[PDB]
Design a protein around this ligand. Sequence first.
Ligand SMILES: C[C@H](CS)C(=O)N1C[C@@H](Sc2ccccc2)C[C@H]1C(=O)O
Ligand SMILES: C[C@H](CS)C(=O)N1C[C@@H](Sc2ccccc2)C[C@H]1C(=O)O
Ligand code: NA
Ligand code: NA
Ligand SMILES: [Zn+2]
Ligand SMILES: [Zn+2]
Ligand SMILES: [Zn+2]
Ligand SMILES: [Zn+2]
Lengths: 486, 486
Amino acid sequence: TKGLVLGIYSKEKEEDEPQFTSAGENFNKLVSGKLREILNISGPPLKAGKTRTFYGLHEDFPSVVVVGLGKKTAGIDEQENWHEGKENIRAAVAAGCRQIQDLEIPSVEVDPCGDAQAAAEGAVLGLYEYDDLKQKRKVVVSAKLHGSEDQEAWQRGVLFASGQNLARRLMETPANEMTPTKFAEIVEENLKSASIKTDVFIRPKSWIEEQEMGSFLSVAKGSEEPPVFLEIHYKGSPNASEPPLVFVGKGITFDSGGISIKAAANMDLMRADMGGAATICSAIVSAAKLDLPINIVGLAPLCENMPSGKANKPGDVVRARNGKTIQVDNTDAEGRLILADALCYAHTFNPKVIINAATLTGAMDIALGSGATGVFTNSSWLWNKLFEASIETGDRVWRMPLFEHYTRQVIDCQLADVNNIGKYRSAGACTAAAFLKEFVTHPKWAHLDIAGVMTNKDEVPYLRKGMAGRPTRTLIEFLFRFSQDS
Amino acid sequence: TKGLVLGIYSKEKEEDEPQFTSAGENFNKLVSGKLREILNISGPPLKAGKTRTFYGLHEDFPSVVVVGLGKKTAGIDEQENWHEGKENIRAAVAAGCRQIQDLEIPSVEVDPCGDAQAAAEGAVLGLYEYDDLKQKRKVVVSAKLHGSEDQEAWQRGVLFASGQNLARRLMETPANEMTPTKFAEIVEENLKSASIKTDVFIRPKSWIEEQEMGSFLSVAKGSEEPPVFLEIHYKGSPNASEPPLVFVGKGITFDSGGISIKAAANMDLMRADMGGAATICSAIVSAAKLDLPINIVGLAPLCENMPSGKANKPGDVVRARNGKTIQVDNTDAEGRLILADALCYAHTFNPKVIINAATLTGAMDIALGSGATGVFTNSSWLWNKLFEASIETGDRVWRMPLFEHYTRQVIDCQLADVNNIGKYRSAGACTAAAFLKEFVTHPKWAHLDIAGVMTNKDEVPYLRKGMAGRPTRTLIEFLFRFSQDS
Ligand SMILES: C[C@H](CS)C(=O)N1C[C@@H](Sc2ccccc2)C[C@H]1C(=O)O
Ligand SMILES: C[C@H](CS)C(=O)N1C[C@@H](Sc2ccccc2)C[C@H]1C(=O)O
Ligand code: NA
Ligand code: NA
Ligand SMILES: [Zn+2]
Ligand SMILES: [Zn+2]
Ligand SMILES: [Zn+2]
Ligand SMILES: [Zn+2]
């Protein structure tokens, strides 16, 4: 059994009937107009993201799912900050593929819908499900481009989507499996499979201690799970000495909050508190697969945050790699602690830019939810590049303020140079960002608080319920454009 | 006794000593160099916002307070989104005036510090205190410009600051005094004192019922305090038919949350839940005092949100003026309910723009705190105008997303067209904004969630602890520039 997903646009006022994509019209022609005929008979027109299934139209395609693509000329939506057409395609195709999968069809050919990359992303992101630990699973669906004219674009979409799906897998996987060591090993095998122009160092605790990362170590010690500092190098630049772009990701494989223990409700989701590491590492893996002509370094401090007889204690003062002391008033604000040391280390690479990602604050979720990743940056150039890339990917970013106003609230510290929690409970994502900035001197640094986009329920149509792996594609697009432009 | 506030800048590397402002150097000359001499003797240089008091330098000024103005050439700070020099002046002067007041001196002359408006704002905003109900009060200080060359700029500052102080007074005043009726009467007398080219209508409940404002009425009915719909007109345009700019403000004189009752802790601050009305009305009063050549309409639905035998009940469905039904799942999300009707009414004026302000969500506070007012708008032109004005005033704004992503979460309603609370608890300010947008069809609408800037502790140096009256000056500046530019 082989399924087929075909797109149809919303009817324009000047048109007598909704128009099929080129593939749709061709298939209709192939079946002597039976597709149009049955679609007409089926009832109301298919709107954006809606689907309808027709059976027995062609011996090779017992199941044909037509999906609504919305307005054919839908481009950049000035109000939504994204290319609407691409988003329509991703959603429609995802919906179509899910329908094919529900019919238990193992193979599906997908209409490029005028944008093969978007179509591929919809199919690949849409079909993804982390079901490795389930006895009962949906049929594995192999999605392929319908036709052979948009191959590179289609594969580009598969690549981008696969990068995000890698992040989703890493985030979704339970923490007892996805330990710091396991995460590092999976990223290592993926990066090495992507290109041999790579180096991966799964730095052990001894190295971390040697690097004087007391902040990171303070978080890790509460747990019996060994911490690791993942360092990955992708040497894509023609010039080996070319300064690299450095990505840093919060890799808390599991966050119980530590002594400042979290509430039980939905704490299981904290297995994705390493989403920052997942997204930046996956983006680098994808950059390597794209063979981007740039040098990139990925840094991911990985550990668990657990309560125990040797765990971080509220009030404890720890020393970051840069010598700055930190008062750990709340052990559940551990992401900024490990990032302090990772960000310090990031400067040793004399990077062109430093971008960190982290499921850093619930405040970010309360601020923008899953609508967009919050971006704190001291460079409007960098903000604009990330923003422009997000318009293309649809995985939106929204700028958040890096004001001294917030810095003042974290450096007002009773015992040390900086407190790991603001003196007020307001603007949690902003004070967390201000804290990170105290460990950054680089002129082009961007902090992405992805706590709000850590999961998906139904907000992003082409992502099934679960860890979202956002905004991996936006980072990939950013890297791609940087390798071409910047 | 008459005090004197003089400014001194931070020493530049090329300078041999920190430089006084023109007024400072002149005074020093007047006292034969004794000011410089004593300042030198006093110790370390005065940094931005710091002050030092010197006594007996001149028979007419027994107390002279020198204040640090920071870098003389401090201009627009690209990272802080404000004119740093103006902010330095406001803070320094406020500090100086507070010192003069502590010395119980009733009159103070203030150095224009190279920017008389900023100096005036610092003095007027800085000295303000709502102490009408206190037996023990600080000495009333009369601040005046030192010299007579920067009079218009100084008075402009006093005007802007007075506008904000009016908002602060309205917000700070206890709700049993600042009732809907009282608020309306105070705004009325202030607007009428500002210009005779005005009309004020304190619309009674009967009018509100006539206007079919069922949403607004649903909120008000729980309380015995009569609701009023304040409608103010400022006819500043040379052309009476010139479309007006319409401002709308949430005027909940007191919010107990209603049946969805609030927690006791700090609920007293909800006497400022009419801050939206306070800021937009005050801005209009100030626009009138500035005699801006534009037509402006101010709309402020005013009422209390109280629990009682006839109060809004969770689940109740009310009908807005535009016929849209609203499911009131949480009676404490009442601001959007009254704004729905006010925003609908705003369209009847065929306005050029519609800007509403409201202490709408705690989510906004969690998002940006008092760092900046969150601005939701469907017009980048409008956003940019507000942003540019905020750079000048220092009362910053930060854009927040108006995405369908959030709309979907409020129109997913069990009983009606729209639910007054999102289906998820994330992005509270965004879903609240999305709710408002369902009552807006205008192409240039901006919603300002000022919940985070409702109060000040010490974030804004020139504002004493209490209701902040923000971002009144930014609205005034916006209006001023619009009357000149747009
Ligand atoms: C998503 C983050 C990172 S794991 C997180 O859970 N935080 C960070 C801080 S916020 C915070 C909460 C209360 C007082 C001070 C800060 C602690 C914890 C929390 O919200 O209680
Ligand atoms: C500042 C605002 C306006 S008065 C406010 O207090 N809200 C608005 C809503 S948010 C909300 C809270 C829980 C569920 C749904 C929405 C209710 C109340 C609150 O936070 O509990
Ligand atoms: Na995980
Ligand atoms: Na009040
Ligand atoms: Zn935590
Ligand atoms: Zn965490
Ligand atoms: Zn309320
Ligand atoms: Zn309220």
